[PDB]
Scaffold this active site. Structure first.
Site, PDB file in Angstrom:
ATOM      1  N   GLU A   1      44.298  48.848  43.333  1.00 17.43           N
ATOM      2  CA  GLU A   1      45.548  49.072  44.037  1.00 17.43           C
ATOM      3  C   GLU A   1      46.676  49.142  43.012  1.00 17.43           C
ATOM      4  OE1 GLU A   1      49.516  47.956  45.526  1.00 17.43           O
ATOM      5  OE2 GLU A   1      48.270  47.069  43.949  1.00 17.43           O
TER       6      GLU A   1
ATOM      7  N   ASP B   1      42.187  43.268  42.654  1.00 20.80           N
ATOM      8  CA  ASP B   1      42.563  43.441  41.259  1.00 20.80           C
ATOM      9  C   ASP B   1      43.928  42.820  40.982  1.00 20.80           C
ATOM     10  OD1 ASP B   1      43.422  45.835  42.802  1.00 20.80           O
ATOM     11  OD2 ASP B   1      44.270  46.489  40.900  1.00 20.80           O
TER      12      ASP B   1
HETATM   13 ZN   LIG Z   1      49.627  43.555  45.287  1.00 20.27          ZN
HETATM   14 ZN   LIG Z   2      50.972  44.075  41.790  1.00 22.15          ZN
END
Ligand SMILES: [Zn+2]
Ligand SMILES: [Zn+2]
Ligand SMILES: [Zn+2]
Ligand SMILES: [Zn+2]
Lengths: 374, 376
Positions: A132, A67
């Site tokens: 993340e 992501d």
């Molecule tokens: Zn990263």
């Molecule tokens: Zn980042």
């Protein structure tokens, strides 16, 4: 550059958190052809991938995310962020630094490594998530939960986050400060701009407070962690009318804190400051990540020699910058070390990476495999 | 039962958020046309306007107002649908119930009764209604006046039905108003990572101290005619929603309601002076909504003082407080202006409402103002 071609394929997939948009499939299809078991792990709106070659220890794991953060003003980009292109030896695109290029280097290094060293010892693994950058409640944390429940331990984990400052590999990270988020909702009373006495302007009341927070000294840090830092990421109030006082003000902020304070000390000190300014509000807190520090061991050693051999640079340990999925992996006991490209342009508009670092980083990662598994 | 209440409901049910009229001016025109008012609709851009006039000679009395209302928002904070007017414990709730559809209705009913009672009245009666008073207001009343002025059609007295009252009906009437200067400040920062702030520029952090000062600044102390200049920030925005991204820009929308002690250019110069002081990089788009204005105390004020006292036993008091109105566009022509209406206590608020017991009295006041100016 096989790293470059793989980078481009990943960079072309719009993957704003928590979207993967075939990224983990692209990686999995590569890895599956070089003896890696493919084990996707869907958790709600997040996609994760556990890929592993070998069934014996030690276990070396490459970690990362597919992501990327939002692009922002699409008209502020000189080139489409999801249409990667090279421009004067610089690769432009959202995720070009954080961190689709590292993802590619880890895969190519893994392929090249397995080719020249097929009967290597231990296992190689990939732990890849598509969340993340955001809540990260259905990402790497849930993968670890699954691994731990079946006693599948990781010995060494190298998170491909962009750890470098000035030149490739000048910095490697074995720890990180904590991350504490808050969404503050200051309540006022919607009314007429020309009749402020009959209303409550939340923007006016909060101003002195936000000003104070922005200048407040939290701690001086310590010898392992930089000082705690405060940042407001978002602020909103009103719907457009110029003659209407808004009823509420939403302020989103964050702390990156050292071990000198706890999430609880920060919370209490913040409410104490808001109370001091006579505000009427509610905060929703969220502990995105705890401060963590893993031991300096063979992973650090393997990386010192790999970096020095490829670039001629003496790396230096640090816990600076943001945080990473290393916070969810470190609790298992794995040695954590972050090593990647320059963080100069991460989360910025016109994010880019120097093409001259892609092959080196690929080589650096390959040699780490050699030092630890051959 | 009340004819004023009845028409109020009818107007209130029309969701006329600036600048959509949603038939309000037609509802009004259909009634005025039955009592001798010529109906001259004037559509400018996406704004509807109505110049309705009974008579061709002076003096000329004009009722002015707007059918548009500020937005409601599906906040859910509303106890009842804002465009579904209803009464609860003698209070009429609904967006525009105070600002200012009840007054519109009262003006129409007063006109109908006045005409039935005094058919051979002298002078002319006119309604100058717009569907954009709350917004930009470039294609509204300002245009009607441009049209009237170009054909030498002058208004003697203009009574604006904005909610002038503070505690009880007709306790305050306004013959003037402070100016209104708007701005959209865009503080330029540099988007980046929250954990690497040195590589970016957080515009929320830089502007924070500057805004704080603007909110605590003393612009002027006003004067005997106008209250002091006031600054208010109406809107503020930065960031898409990501918690680890420093936004590239902050947008701040603010307003000055100013006295005759300062000019728009003086305010503009101090603001930049303060912003530059804090070393901000920005651009401001200014928009002068209205100039301060003060019309003379004449016959209209006398007729209003008398009307009010006779209807409520209250001695009205002059003022230029509150916001502004379309009087800012009518005043330049020479018309005496006077704003008289319901309480302003809940205007632009959630659960806006008006005390029903003020509708019939307000209507009587308007009718008596007509009687004192055009009958005897
Ligand atoms: Zn990263
Ligand atoms: Zn980042
Ligand atoms: Zn109004
Ligand atoms: Zn209004």
């Amino acid at each position: 550059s096989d790293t470059l071609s793989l980078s481009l394929e990943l960079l072309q997939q719009p993957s704003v958190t928590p979207i993967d948009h075939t990224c983990q499939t692209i990686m999995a299809d590569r890895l599956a052809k070089v003896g890696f078991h493919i084990e996707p792990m869907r958790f709600g709106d997040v996609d994760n991938l556990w890929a592993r070659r070998g069934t014996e220890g030690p276990v070396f794991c490459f970690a990362g995310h597919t992501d990327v953060v939002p692009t922002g003003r699409l008209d502020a980009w000189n080139s489409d962020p999801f249409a990667p292109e090279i421009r004067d030896g610089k690769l432009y695109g959202r995720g070009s630094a954080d961190m689709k290029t590292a993802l590619a280097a880890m895969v190519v290094a893994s392929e090249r490594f397995v080719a020249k060293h097929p009967n290597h010892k231990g296992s190689i693994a990939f732990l890849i998530t598509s969340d993340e950058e955001g809540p990260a409640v259905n990402g790497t944390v849930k993968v670890i939960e699954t691994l731990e429940k079946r006693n599948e331990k990781i010995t060494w984990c190298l998170v491909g986050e962009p750890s470098s400052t000035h030149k490739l590999g000048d910095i490697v990270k074995n720890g990180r400060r904590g991350s504490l988020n808050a969404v503050l909702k200051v309540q006022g009373k919607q009314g007429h701009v020309a009749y402020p006495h009959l209303a409550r302007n939340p923007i006016h009341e909060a101003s002195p407070a936000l000003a104070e927070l922005c200048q407040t000294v939290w701690d001086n840090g310590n010898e392992y962690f930089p000082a705690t830092s405060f940042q407001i990421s978002n602020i909103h109030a009103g719907t457009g009318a110029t003659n209407v006082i808004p009823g509420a003000l939403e302020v989103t902020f964050n702390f990156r804190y050292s071990t000198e304070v706890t999430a609880e000390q920060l919370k209490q000190r913040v409410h104490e400051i808001l109370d001091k300014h006579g505000l009427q509000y509610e905060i929703v807190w969220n502990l995105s990540g705890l401060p963590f520090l893993t031991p300096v061991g063979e992973l650090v050693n393997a990386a010192q020699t790999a970096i020095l051999n490829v670039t001629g640079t003496e790396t230096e340990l640090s816990t600076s910058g943001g945080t990473s999925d290393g916070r969810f992996i470190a609790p298992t006991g794995a040695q954590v070390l972050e090593l990647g490209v320059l963080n100069a342009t991460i989360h910025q508009i016109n994010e880019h990476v120097d093409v001259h670092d892609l092959d080196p980083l690929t080589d650096i990662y390959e040699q780490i495999l050699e030092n630890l598994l051959a």
